[PDB]
Amino acid sequence: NPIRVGVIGCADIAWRRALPALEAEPLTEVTAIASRRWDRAKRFTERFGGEPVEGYPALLERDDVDAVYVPLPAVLHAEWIDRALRAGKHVLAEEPLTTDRPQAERLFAVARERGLLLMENFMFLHHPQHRQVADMLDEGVIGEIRSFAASFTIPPVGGGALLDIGVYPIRAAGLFLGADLEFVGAVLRHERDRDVVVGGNALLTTRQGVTAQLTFGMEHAYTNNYEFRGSTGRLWMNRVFTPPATYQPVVHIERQDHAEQFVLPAHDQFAKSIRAFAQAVLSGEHPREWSEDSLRQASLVDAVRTGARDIYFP
Numbered sequence: 001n002p003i004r005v006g007v008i009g010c011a012d013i014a015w016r017r018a019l020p021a022l023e024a025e026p027l028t029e030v031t032a033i034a035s036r037r038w039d040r041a042k043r044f045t046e047r048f049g050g051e052p053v054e055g056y057p058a059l060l061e062r063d064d065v066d067a068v069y070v071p072l073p074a075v076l077h078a079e080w081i082d083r084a085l086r087a088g089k090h091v092l093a094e095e096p097l098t099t100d101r102p103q104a105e106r107l108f109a110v111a112r113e114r115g116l117l118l119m120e121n122f123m124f125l126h127h128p129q130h131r132q133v134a135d136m137l138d139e140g141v142i143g144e145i146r147s148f149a150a151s152f153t154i155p156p157v158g159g160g161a162l163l164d165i166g167v168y169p170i171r172a173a174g175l176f177l178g179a180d181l182e183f184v185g186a187v188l189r190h191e192r193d194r195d196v197v198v199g200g201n202a203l204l205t206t207r208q209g210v211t212a213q214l215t216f217g218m219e220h221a222y223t224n225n226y227e228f229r230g231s232t233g234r235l236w237m238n239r240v241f242t243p244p245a246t247y248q249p250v251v252h253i254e255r256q257d258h259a260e261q262f263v264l265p266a267h268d269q270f271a272k273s274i275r276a277f278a279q280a281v282l283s284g285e286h287p288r289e290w291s292e293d294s295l296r297q298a299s300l301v302d303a304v305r306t307g308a309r310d311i312y313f314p
């Protein structure tokens with residue numbers, strides 16, 4: 001008996017990743033899609049099934065809905081996740097969960113009181129390539145880790161590039177370097193014209209001095225990678241955040257006089273993360289690490305927003 005999923009917001013990202021996945025996943029059934037415009041709802045249900053609903057409250061009211069996918073704009077997550085939890089729906093919220101740490105704690109508290117799952121959807125965490133990369137690092141392939149770089153940049157209620165893009169490299173640092181990451185300094189470029197963060201660069205460190213240099217933005221050519229400098233080599237990889245389901249990662253390693261590349265298996269991370277959500281909802285095993293990782297994440301992001309030097313242009 002698959003969990004019945006309602007989607008609120010007919011997002012691009014739901015159109016391209018989440019709904020195809022929801023659709024293909026046995027453990028989940030798309031029962032309802034809601035849109036500010038009935039026609040858009042409808043364009044979406046013709047594609048992926050379910051009842052097209054106009055407005056989001058109406059979908060929260062349905063009894064044929066156990067869980068809600070929220071691919072809305074970041075600044076609008078808090079209202080709707082909070083409303084979906086209050087209607088008794090478990091929630092799968094696109095990254096970032098929300099805009100700040102204190103709002104993230106409140107959404108988790110609302111969920112905790114009702115025993116509902118609130119999961120922040122970082123598709124990338126669900127791709128086995130990261131763990132294959134981490135096992136190589138643990139095996140010593142480049143000796144001790146000295147520092148980490150990650151970059152996600154792309155060509156040009158809005159999030160801004162910190163919230164919508166910066167979050168990836170920052171989560172990757174969190175994933176690889178651990179829970180003690182502290183802000184050191186960052187810069188954020190803001191476009192005066194539309195008043196919006198369009199890119200930036202952050203520097204973090206663990207307490208042992210393993211630094212992370214994270215780049216993000218939307219005024220750039222596409223890059224989507226990370227790099228580990230160790231005491232005896234380096235390791236980098238491309239398409240680390242959004243590898244296609246059929247794309248085979250290639251781990252690049254260099255050491256003195258020697259370089260290697262390892263091709264890894266293809267994996268559907270969007271499928272796997274929908275499956276992970278469905279599993280946690282069906283079993284009621286809601287891993288604590290997830291919510292504690294989201295809280296820590298939200299803190300580094302607030303740390304970056306606040307502590308960054310902000311620069312307006314021109």
Ligand SMILES: NC(=O)c1ccc[n+]([C@@H]2O[C@H](COP(=O)([O-])OP(=O)(O)OC[C@H]3O[C@@H](n4cnc5c(N)ncnc54)[C@H](OP(=O)(O)O)[C@@H]3O)[C@@H](O)[C@H]2O)c1
Pocket residue numbers: 008009010011012013014034035036037040041071072073074076094095096157159163164165
């Ligand atoms: N493409 C991206 O920008 C991007 C990149 C990485 C991550 N994400 C994450 O995925 C989530 C959604 O982004 P997306 O890329 O799929 O963006 P999108 O196409 O803007 O989707 C936002 C959707 O939310 C609904 N919405 C409700 N109020 C809105 C408003 N005032 N203005 C615009 N849309 C409104 C709209 O759905 P209805 O019209 O059907 O109501 C719209 O289709 C965000 O959390 C984002 O951080 C997005």
Ligand SMILES: Cc1cn([C@H]2C[C@H](O)[C@@H](COP(=O)(O)OP(=O)(O)Oc3ccccc3)O2)c(=O)[nH]c1=O
Pocket residue numbers: 013154155164165222224242
């Ligand atoms: C391959 C590729 C993409 N894009 C553009 C196309 C698109 O605008 C953007 C991201 O493409 P993707 O990494 O595929 O990420 P998702 O669409 O899954 O979702 C996100 C959207 C925005 C932020 C992050 C994820 O870069 C390019 O400009 N060049 C490329 O080679």
Ligand SMILES: Cc1cn([C@H]2C[C@H](O)[C@@H](COP(=O)(O)OP(=O)(O)Oc3ccccc3)O2)c(=O)[nH]c1=O
Pocket residue numbers: 120122125126130131132134175176276289290291293294
């Ligand atoms: C799934 C997932 C994890 N985490 C947190 C929870 C956990 O703290 C961390 C990773 O979760 P896991 O993918 O199970 O761990 P592996 O060893 O397989 O992958 C590694 C890959 C690289 C380096 C370390 C581990 O992210 C989340 O916040 N959300 C999620 O959806």
Ligand SMILES: [Cl-]
Pocket residue numbers: 238250
């Ligand atoms: Cl490559």
Ligand code: NA
Pocket residue numbers: 304305306307308309310
């Ligand atoms: Na600041």
